Amino acid sequence: FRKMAFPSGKVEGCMVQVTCGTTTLNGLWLDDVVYCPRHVICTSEDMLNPNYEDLLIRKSNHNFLVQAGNVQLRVIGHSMQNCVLKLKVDTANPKTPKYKFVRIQPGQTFSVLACYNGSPSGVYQCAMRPNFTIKGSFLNGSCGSVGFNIDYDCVSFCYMHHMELPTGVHAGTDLEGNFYGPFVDRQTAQAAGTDTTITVNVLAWLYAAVINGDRWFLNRFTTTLNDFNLVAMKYNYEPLTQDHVDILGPLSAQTGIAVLDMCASLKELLQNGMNGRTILGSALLEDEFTPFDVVRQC
Amino acid sequence: FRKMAFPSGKVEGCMVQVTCGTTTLNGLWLDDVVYCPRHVICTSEDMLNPNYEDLLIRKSNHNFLVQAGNVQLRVIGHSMQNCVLKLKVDTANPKTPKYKFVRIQPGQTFSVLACYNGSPSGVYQCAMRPNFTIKGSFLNGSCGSVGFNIDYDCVSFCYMHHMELPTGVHAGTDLEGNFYGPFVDRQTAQAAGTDTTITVNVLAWLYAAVINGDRWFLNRFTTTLNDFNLVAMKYNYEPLTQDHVDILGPLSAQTGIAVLDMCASLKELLQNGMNGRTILGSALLEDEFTPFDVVRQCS
């Protein structure tokens, strides 16, 4: 059982390069608009404390160089929506998929298409963590890379990449330009809130380990939902709601293991540890598979 | 570090479905040829021990239903090359990328585009194990899904999926139809060889650790390749080849740590264990990142 990203082709056909001065990042070209992080308009001196409305009023359309491969796209207009710049171009992208912009909830997963110079480089699955960071793999030049899910040929864009934190995790916005989390697009070291574990996802992954044949961690012990949540909070695990229990229904029926019985197994793992043993090859409890992600492979 | 697949779009544009009777699997459409597993021509009764040569004689071009989506591609010729069927079609795929067919070595990684009925469902990174099996997510109907690497817009196709083994792992061929490992395309329980740890990838992992400033395990020793290989086998590690030493060249140059010095450090880890210490925040040595994978995620 491994992490699986959505096929990225529908998004690859939308990636372009956007340059302002000596700052270059990626943009998303949908119909006749290119979306990109607004910090492209900054210089090295601007990034420390940027007044974006002032920086933007001093820009012209011709200050933006947009390249789709080797073809230059003429910028005929520009506006800013929160932390995203919207550049209107004179040509429509014929590869524009059916799409929506969505704001994802913490604990949900999405695929990231990491891009450099407008060229796709890799695809991998991430989760929006409870503290609103993502454990991404992003280097210099990756800004404007997007995260997405795909449902029946429709691409739901949920993330655009803006910055890295000192702990090595990443922060960005939705496609309306609003950050996930208490972060700001300025060149400062920013800490996140406490990184809690996505309990419903851990439970789904334990179910996946059972479907795969592993069950050394199961027990005959029992727990109530409230008593489980008291232990979960003590170990910085997110609360498990009744909705989560309901969502875990299909996995529970398939394995014949009641949700609260799997909660009792997880409680033992938190209290006693794994004792050198591994689950699905991992020495740590994995929390970036949703129940839906598990079902799609099982 | 994380498993990162290549962008799959260039391969998505080559996936089709191939049906004989009620059996549908995936095929790969490049120029005017569709490549797919030859067992598409089998009925359930044929799968125990098919006479593929005899089964193919009873097939004509008009027996093959090849579809890109719902659009049929007319077959104008057919032939068998090892375990792959090649169907010549009347239309050259306009989405054909620059491509090569490569046969990979154990330990090499590649991206799999898992497909069903010619429709891609997901993309993930796989490592070819030393016993020539892969740990994929392959359900019913996944055969003909391909594995690939992409270098400078050129797709190197290296794997086509054919079957599952009783242990839950998977086996397949290159795009010339030659199985990786000692497997055959029949509906029989076949055992893989005992698996071993991919030494060259563990070494790549240790280099990655050094690159990120985690270097407590470096020692003042060196070893010969033969001495290391004899020790490695006692710990169920794969012996190194000359090609392995060569592919570690770039990481050795980046860190200044000779390959054989790193081998000596690994040998010490094998003989002494970790002793509560971690490397890259883990007490377990990772063996599914190649030297190339490490260079990619560092830059």
UniProtKB/Swiss-Prot annotation, chain A:
The gene is rep. Changing L203V: In strain: Zeta/P.2. Changing Q187A: Does not affect ability to cleave and inactivate human TRMT1. Changing P130H: In strain: Omicron/BA.1, Omicron/BA.2, Omicron/BA.2.12.1, Omicron/BA.2.75, Omicron/BA.4, Omicron/BA.5, Omicron/BQ.1.1, Omicron/XBB.1.5, Omicron/EG.5.1. It catalyses: TSAVLQ-|-SGFRK-NH2 and SGVTFQ-|-GKFKK the two peptides corresponding to the two self-cleavage sites of the SARS 3C-like proteinase are the two most reactive peptide substrates. The enzyme exhibits a strong preference for substrates containing Gln at P1 position and Leu at P2 position. This is 3C-like proteinase nsp5. Residues 1-298 are cytoplasmic. 3CL-PRO exists as monomer and homodimer. Only the homodimer shows catalytic activity. Interacts with host FBXO22; this interaction promotes the proteasomal degradation of nsp5. Inhibited by pyridone-containing alpha-ketoamides compounds 13a and 13b. In turn, alpha-ketoamide 13b (tert-butyl (1-((S)-1-(((S)-4-(benzylamino)-3,4-dioxo-1-((S)-2-oxopyrrolidin-3-yl)butan-2-yl)amino)-3-cyclopropyl-1-oxopropan-2-yl)-2-oxo-1,2-dihydropyridin-3-yl)carbamate) inhibits SARS-CoV-2 replication in human lung cells. Inhibited ex vivo by michael acceptor inhibitor N3. Inhibited ex vivo by compound 11a and 11b. The lineage of its organism: Viruses, Riboviria, Orthornavirae, Pisuviricota, Pisoniviricetes. The active site is at H39 (for 3cl-pro activity), C143 (nucleophile).
